[PDB]
Design a protein around this ligand. Structure first.
Ligand SMILES: [N+]
Ligand SMILES: [N+]
Lengths: 406, 406
């Protein structure tokens, strides 16, 4: 019954430590990919990544950060940004049963997982491991480490679904409002960046390895010469709020979440089926009387993945193909954080009336012909935008965000 | 106002590889805890665990199990059981957009996360890692590895919330039914058992260490001399179905999920606040006018935890305190799988009309005086039951189930 709107946002990414820096990188088509000595020293073939250029030292209370892994740190910082940007203060969101938090990561924390095991196998055993590994390594790290410090009393858990993680978190936050269970739910996610996790994707042959010489060119979605995605880290958080509650406090509304699709391929364990994406996007558009002006694709810069989604988009729109661009060409694939970060990039485009350019397309892919793939920053009054997230295991999420009518 | 009921269950636990085996253990007060040479050799202080007594080799198609970690294997097997128990044919649940899956684990797969790191640092590097580590180590492994094989086309993601994990999965499934989004949702979870993850808890002082010589006596919820929980592994899965859909196909209905609570402490990172648990139980009892005949407590056998929950129970029911037992005294703490497995123990008790005993109470804690803690198998006609799951990070979940008329 209730309607859900976004009244605040926060982000820590490879292209910016806040919405202002991110906004700048987007309009400039700036890349956040750099060379990683860490990735190379570990023995990996991929030597590039989208790291967060930020010294988080002292940004979080000692007693709070002690239980956190990088995924939680990034998300926590993003939640602080979202809270302020939303105009909310402790007395309104803390110790409030009507306020919740749904945020997760794609891989929890392989770094502290490996750290624990390594320390344990040392001569110090349990003493070397320390009593803080559990909250850093568990899959619910991102929600646990934020809900406690921020005095959250409402819902509190993490949803995980690979590349769609933070997208489902947002969707589930919407469901909480529609059900009348919560007035506000902070939704988002975070993902650390480390060789410990990245080597898993490399050994799987999913990471780019032919552009370690030119980092900024590795992520080239839709480019006939693409050879895998560039792994990234970071966080993002949005304030999902019930409409009347937002209007009552004079909140600043970025947009309304008019659509939320969640489906499953039930086909391949690693590659997309397309059939699932089609149903997902259509589910998100069901009921929306306005057309999609911009579509922030999943496009991770992979041979099959890129083309599969485009084929799914054709099936859904046909001759009504909206503007399309893969921001991952700039940011990289932050995995669990991608969902909320990309949703934010879309909100920034909707809020500032512009479309981010799909960079590094030196030679468009034949199977991408007949579509409107924007490769240059173009100014335009967007009204309804769409964001897709398709992760391993055939899990699909689609969000449709539209401006509010005055 | 859709109603959700349970029409099938499946389980792989320390006390049984199917509902018949588990039924027997519950009635007999049989312990599923054994001595673990693995834990001892790892350098841990806790040398006991609730292990699955079953060789899973060859039970799952080679091409399917190749992507799975133990959490997924246990959950997968549990799901096969739930499907058969619910009487669902392949064409009744496969390739069906109205059929989904919501299942997760508390820690993904620390073993394979460590394996990948160990292998990567070896003389083979990437080659030793292999292309199956991602689907085994990621937090969403349990939903990803099941949705694909079972051809699920509906919702597909994992919920993570430590000890409450599979409980939230069930609650979220109920939400999908109430929202009219799905007719059937398989809900549950799995958790591997390994020193890699276990040492983390031991290093936190959360595991029992004074009863390694008498494994079956280590887990003793409410006993004055309790000293931590006994870690365990396993899986569980239930079929959450919309009432009309189940009735039309003549399904066997165990009970209706008449209440679902989900709250947050927003206080301590590893200790329960109690205040959050009170709200969670009250939320699950909203609209439930039938009395609680039996309460399956979270009671992990920890000094502070056990009594915190009893206090919360006293505040909720006052002088209307229901019969109580902590099945963890027999089974150990399966973490991510505890929610669904205990919901299953609760459903067996309700289906068969008996209350399993809260074993190993040689000296009842003084703060439990006045309560109705059942220490011996008692036959009785139950109608409404409650099962609590409170995980680290201050995340709470409560489920209330009730028998349907005639
Ligand atoms: N996206
Ligand atoms: N329980």
């Amino acid at each position: 019954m209730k309607r859900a709107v976004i009244t605040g946002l926060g982000i820590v990414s490879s292209i910016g430590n806040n919405q202002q820096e991110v906004l700048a990188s987007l309009r400039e088509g700036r890349s956040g990919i750099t060379f990683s000595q860490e990735l190379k020293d570990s023995g990996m073939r991929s030597h590039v990544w989208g790291n967060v250029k930020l010294d988080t030292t002292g940004l979080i209370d000692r007693k709070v950060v002690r239980f956190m892994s990088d995924a939680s740190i990034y998300a926590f910082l993003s939640m602080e940004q979202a809270i302020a940007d939303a105009g909310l203060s402790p007395e309104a969101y803390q110790n409030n049963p009507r306020v919740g938090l749904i945020a997760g990561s794609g891989g929890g924390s392989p770094r502290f997982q490996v750290f624990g095991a390594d320390a344990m196998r040392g001569p110090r055993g349990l003493k070397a491991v320390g009593p803080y590994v559990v909250t850093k390594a568990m899959a619910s790290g991102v929600s646990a480490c934020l809900a406690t410090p921020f005095k959250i009393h409402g819902v509190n858990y993490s949803i995980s679904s690979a590349c769609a993680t933070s997208a489902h978190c947002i969707g589930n936050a919407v469901e909480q409002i529609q059900l009348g269970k919560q007035d506000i739910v902070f939704a988002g996610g975070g993902e650390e960046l480390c060789w410990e996790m990245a080597c898993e994707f490399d050994a799987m042959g999913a990471l780019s390895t032919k552009y370690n010489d030119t980092p900024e060119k590795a992520s080239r979605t839709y480019d006939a010469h693409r050879d895998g995605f560039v792994i990234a880290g970071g966080g993002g958080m949005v304030v999902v709020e019930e409409l009347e509650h937002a209007l009552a406090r004079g909140a600043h509304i970025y947009a309304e979440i008019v659509g939320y699709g969640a489906t499953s391929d039930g086909a391949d364990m690693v590659a997309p089926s397309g059939e699932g994406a089609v149903r997902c996007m259509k589910m998100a558009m069901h009921g929306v009387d306005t057309p999609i002006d911009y579509l922030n694709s999943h496009g991770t810069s992979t041979p099959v993945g890129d083309v599969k989604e485009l084929a799914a988009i054709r099936e859904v729109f046909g001759d009504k193909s909206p503007a399309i661009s893969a921001t991952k060409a700039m940011t990289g694939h932050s995995l669990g954080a991608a969902g909320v970060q990309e949703a934010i990039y879309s909100l920034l485009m909707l809020e500032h009336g512009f479309i981010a350019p799909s960079i590094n397309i030196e030679e468009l892919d034949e199977q991408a012909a007949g579509l409107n793939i924007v490769t240059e920053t173009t100014d335009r009054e967007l009204t309804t935008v769409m964001s897709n997230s398709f992760g391993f295991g055939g899990t699909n999420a689609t969000l449709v965000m539209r401006k509010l009518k005055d």
